[PDB]
Amino acid sequence: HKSEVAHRFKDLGEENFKALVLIAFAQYLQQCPFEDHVKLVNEVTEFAKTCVADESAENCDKSLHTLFGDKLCTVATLRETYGEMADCCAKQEPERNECFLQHKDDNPNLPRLVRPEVDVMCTAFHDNEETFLKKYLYEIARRHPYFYAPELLFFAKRYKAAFTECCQAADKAACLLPKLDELRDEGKASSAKQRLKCASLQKFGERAFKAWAVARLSQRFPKAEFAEVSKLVTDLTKVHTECCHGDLLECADDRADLAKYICENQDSISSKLKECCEKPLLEKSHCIAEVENDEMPADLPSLAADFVESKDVCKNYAEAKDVFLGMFLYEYARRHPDYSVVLLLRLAKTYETTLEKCCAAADPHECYAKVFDEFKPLVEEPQNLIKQNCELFEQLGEYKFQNALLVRYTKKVPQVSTPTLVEVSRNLGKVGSKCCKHPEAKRMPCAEDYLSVVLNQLCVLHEKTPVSDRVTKCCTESLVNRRPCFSALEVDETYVPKEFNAETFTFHADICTLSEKERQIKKQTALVELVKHKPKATKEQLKAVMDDFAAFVEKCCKADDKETCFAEEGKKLVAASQAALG
Ligand SMILES: COc1cccc2c1cc([N+](=O)[O-])c1c(C(=O)O)cc3c(c12)OCO3
Ligand SMILES: CCCCCCCCCCCCCC(=O)O
Ligand SMILES: CCCCCCCCCCCCCC(=O)O
Ligand SMILES: CCCCCCCCCCCCCC(=O)O
Ligand SMILES: CCCCCCCCCCCCCC(=O)O
Ligand SMILES: CCCCCCCCCCCCCC(=O)O
Ligand SMILES: CCCCCCCCCCCCCC(=O)O
């Protein structure tokens, strides 16, 4: 177009335009005050409007990269605040924008964002909606400078509905806090997959990413032909490679191009895309990414004919090995939306290894005849684990399910910090709660998605503060092998028990007067610390001690004197528990 900024403004709408321009400045100038970015936004928006009225007005034909970089270089404090990033302004485009991109700081060391009281939030929301929500947007954007801006905007708009509904409710906090917790966990998760996907592309290559994408898109678009899936995989690989480089506008163009191709070809891809494809550009590609799987075609034949029985297996494979493995993966995936993507990749890897071994033999068919039997234990292993864990979650409830996991994992890797053991065990309990309510045909994809987020969080914490080599291995192997690796962890035999520290097992009266969540953590903390002190304790000996602590709390809490109970009866529980484990 003659004026990129006019076209963006017309397509997006003023309100969406303003929001994104705020996110984009906040992601680059992460240390500047909210009020400075509001002024930059208003100037850029006023200029955009001059181009909307006349596409030939002065400077309106400059690239949006040029205008954005030009405006970055107007910031008076650029050098004093950002140092060498101010030297980016001495370059011309496209080198200037590349330079700015390299100075985004993924760890800007900003104070934690403190959640105000519910009534303070609802009063701020009422008295000034715009500043209230837009300031928070700026705060999140400047802490998450690679977070895809449109998706950050999609989260922000859902906060409005939450405040509109809950601030007119009778119990405002009971209404509002669960939704804000859900929105925040959803945001942190989306951030987790984004950074996880880019890291995986760098370490394990384009080929491995394409394999993941064949499987995922074949589950999603089972009626599409392989040639069509393969094209989508190529284009999707390009989009993610560009989006991982990190420039908003080049990412957004690639994503919109793919969405428009998908929407122009729905007849050959999926019957479930009509709604997404009538949405505005801003939302189309995100909507398509969340489309539910199309219904699979009826009475599809078994894979045995083309991949085991045919005389031409080895010949078709040898001609173009990755194209044939892709076809095997496409046929298997489209038939099994109930499988994790990584389970499908394990079947593909198994098939490839067998073909590599067997096509060398004189009778390849006899060699690979039973290959589909090799898939049986790979499929049943996750299926059985889901059943086991969903049964225990129902028997125990979320909390006591968390406690069963906490003891299990503390014994397996007792060297992990207690805060991490508590947080990870809790989050794993929440994966059980979420995914065990899905029917069996959607449980493995759910667990794959939410475990990826939890195990990724574990691994980042552990890379930052390494303590266990077994965890470093599970965290550094292929993503296909990460969860089985962790599942294979065994109780640590060579752990020397941590020395007794009395204050660790000293509880005061405040425990009764604490948020139910914080009371769970503190109880979960002493449970880990108990296991860390006596890692050979039995389930019998542990539930016995945990029952004594449960009386110790309920008595000393509803007592005329609470403190003296905690200190005197506290020595009694510790000494009894000490003898009951030593
Ligand atoms: C893209 O993320 C956001 C966009 C827009 C608003 C918010 C938000 C993220 C968060 N947060 O901190 O994760 C919150 C919280 C919270 O959870 O404390 C409390 C709030 C919020 C937001 O708007 C007013 O009150
Ligand atoms: C058509 C392009 C993709 C073809 C992929 C065929 C299968 C590749 C090998 C098996 C999967 C390996 C996955 C991984 O190493 O992470
Ligand atoms: C000075 C303006 C700089 C920022 C401009 C932001 C434009 C973002 C458009 C995003 C469209 C999303 C499309 C898609 O994700 O498929
Ligand atoms: C950056 C990704 C843009 C996505 C555009 C639509 C592509 C097809 C959607 C099917 C699901 C893809 C999920 C994924 O991208 O990991
Ligand atoms: C506590 C987590 C949810 C309950 C069941 C989890 C069982 C292990 C993971 C299932 C499969 C995930 C993906 C995979 O490795 O194929
Ligand atoms: C983060 C605490 C120490 C390490 C814990 C490893 C986590 C293993 C989870 C593997 C997948 C679920 C297994 C299960 O649900 O039984
Ligand atoms: C070394 C002696 C320690 C004795 C005290 C151990 C306290 C463990 C409490 C764990 C409670 C978890 C279950 C519950 O929520 O009641």
Curated annotation (Swiss-Prot):
List site positions: Aspirin-acetylated lysine: K197
Effect ascribed to mutating D561N: In Fukuoka-1/Paris-2
The subcellular localization recorded is:
Secreted
Q: What is this protein called?
A: Albumin
Q: How does it assemble?
A: Interacts with FCGRT; this interaction regulates ALB homeostasis. Interacts with TASOR. In plasma, occurs in a covalently-linked complex with chromophore-bound alpha-1-microglobulin with molar ratio 1:2 and 1:1; this interaction does not prevent fatty acid binding to ALB.
What result follows from mutating E380K?
In Hiroshima-2
Tell me what effect the entry lists for K534E: In Castel di Sangro
The UniProt annotation places (4Z,15Z)-bilirubin IXalpha binding at: K238
Describe the effect of H1Q.
In Nagasaki-3
Q: What is the effect of changing K558E?
A: In Church bay
Annotated S-S bridges? C51-C60, C73-C89, C88-C99, C122-C167, C166-C175, C198-C244, C243-C251, C263-C277, C276-C287, C314-C359, C358-C367, C390-C436, C435-C446, C459-C475, C474-C485, C512-C557, C556-C565
Q: Which organism is it from?
A: Homo sapiens
Q: Phosphothreonine (modified residue): where?
A: T81, T418, T420
